[PDB]
Amino acid sequence: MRECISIHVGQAGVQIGNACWELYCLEHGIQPDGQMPSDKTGGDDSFNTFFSETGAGKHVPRAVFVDLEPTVVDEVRTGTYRQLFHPEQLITGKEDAANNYARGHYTIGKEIVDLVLDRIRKLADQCTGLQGFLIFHSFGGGTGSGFASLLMERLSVDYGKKSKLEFAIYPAPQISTAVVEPYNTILTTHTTLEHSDCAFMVDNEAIYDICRRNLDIERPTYTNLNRLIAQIVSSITASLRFDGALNVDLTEFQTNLVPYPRIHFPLATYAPVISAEKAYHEQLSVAEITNACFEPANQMVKCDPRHGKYMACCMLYRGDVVPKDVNAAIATIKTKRTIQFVDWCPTGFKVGINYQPPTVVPGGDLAKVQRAVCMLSNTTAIAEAWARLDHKFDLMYAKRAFVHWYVGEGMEEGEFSEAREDLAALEKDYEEVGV
C-alpha cells in the first residue's frame, strides 16, 4: 500500500542515493539486475515503499536521479548498478550549474525541470498509496541550491498535501568546499522554507568527528559518510515497510516534529555507530543507546544542544527492542537535568519501534548490531548555526564580492537582501519561540 518516491539532486544527492539504494537492495534482497536472488523470492512484500515490479520480476526503484553535470550520472550508468535504475529516470543535463544558484535556478533549471516533473508525475500515477517525497539534496551550491528549490516550487504547486521531506547536507562552521556556499545556502533556504515540509540537516564535519571518535576509521572519505546517511534514511523509513510496535507514517512523522510552520529544520542522529572491535566489548542495551543519542559528541550536525532547548524529539527504535526499557530510558532522559526541554512542550517524545533488525553492509565499517536508534531532534541550537551563515552572508555581501556572476545571470540583485531579511526574521522567530 505504502510508497514514497526519492528524488536525488546534485552530485552529493546522486552519490548519497547510490549508497542509499545499495543498502536498500541489500536489505530487501534484490540483485543489481532486479531479480530475486537464487529464485528464493515466504511471500516477502516489504519493498513497495521503494521498488515497483514491471513484469518479469524486475524490481525497478522509485528514484529520480537528476543533475546538470553528466559526470556522476554517467558513473551511475556505467557502474555496477546500471541494470537496476530506469534510464529515463536517470536524468542529466549538459552544462553544470557550477556552484551558482542563479544559473541552477533560472538558466539551466528551466530546461530540464519539465522533464523531471513529468517523470515524477509518471511515478506518482504508477503508485497508488503515495506517502511523500524524500528529496536527498545538498544546500552546497549550484544544482542542489537552485534546481532543488525549483523542484520544491514546481512540486508544491502541483501535489500540495503530500509530505515533502528534504534531506540536506548542511555546510560546516569551518569546513566548507565552495566559497560562494553561504550565498547559495541562504538563497536556497529562503526559497525552500515556504514550500518544504521537514528539512533534515546533516553536516559533513560532524560525521567526520563521529567516524573518528567511534568506528575505527582514521581516513573517512565520502563513501563511509554516504553509507551512514543510508543507515539514517533506512532507520527513518523502516516503519513504512516493516511491521511491529508503534509505526510512524510520513504524516505522523512530519506533523510531530514541526511545531510552527517557520521551524521545520530538525537534526538526525543515529547512535549505535560502533564497529566490531568496540562492539565486542560492550552490551548495547536500550537505555544506554538512548542516552548515547543525546551526547554533544555524538551528533551529526556541528552544533551542541547545550546552547538551546529541545522542542520535539523522535525516537525511532529498530530491532530487538521492547517498549518497557524504552519507557524507562525516556523517563530517565527527561529527569536528567542537563537536557533542558522547552517550557511550552511538556510531552515531546514521538516514539516509534520497528521489529526489523538493521542490515549490515558487507565489506562496510559498522557492525551487526541488534538495535538501532534514530534521534530526530528539534533543538533551538540550530539558531547559532543559522546566525553564523548570516554572518558569512553579511561579510561577503558587505563589499559586494561574488555578486557580479549573479548579476550577469538573469537574476535581480535585491533578493539577496530579501533572503537575508527572511533569514533574520527566521532567527528572530527562533529567539522568540525559544524563550
Binding site: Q31, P37, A276, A279, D320, G363, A367
Partner: protein
Amino acid sequence: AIGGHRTSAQMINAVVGGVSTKGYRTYGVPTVRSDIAAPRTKRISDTKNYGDESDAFGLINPSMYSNKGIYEKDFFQPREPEQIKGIFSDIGVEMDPETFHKLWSVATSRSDQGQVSVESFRNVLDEVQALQLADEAQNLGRP
C-alpha cells in the same frame, strides 16, 4: 598508473550473492537472555529475564501444568532413559523394552546431542500413534 583505475565510486561493492554476511556475529545482548546461564535460584534482585517466566497469557491464563508446579524446565530437562521409562510406566503406557528402545532411537535421531526430554518423547509418541491411526484409516473404511 602505479595503482589501478578505481574511480572511488566503485568502493560501493556489496550486492546480494556476494560475501553473504548471514551467520557472522550479532553484537549486543538480547532482551530474553537465552544464551547465558539460567538461575536455579534467582536472586531477589537481578531482573534479567533469563528465558524463564512467561507471557501474560501464561500468567493470567496458566495451564494446569504450570499450576501446582511443573514449569517448562521439567519438560526439556535432558533426562535419563530409565527415568523416562519409569515415568511413562507409572503413567501406564506399558511398552516392552524393544519398543521403548526403538522410540528412544527415533527420539535421539530427531534431537541432537542425545538428550531426549520427556516432551520430545511425548511428541514422538504422538507421531507414532497418529501414524498407526492413519494407517488404520488407510487400510480400513470410514466408521
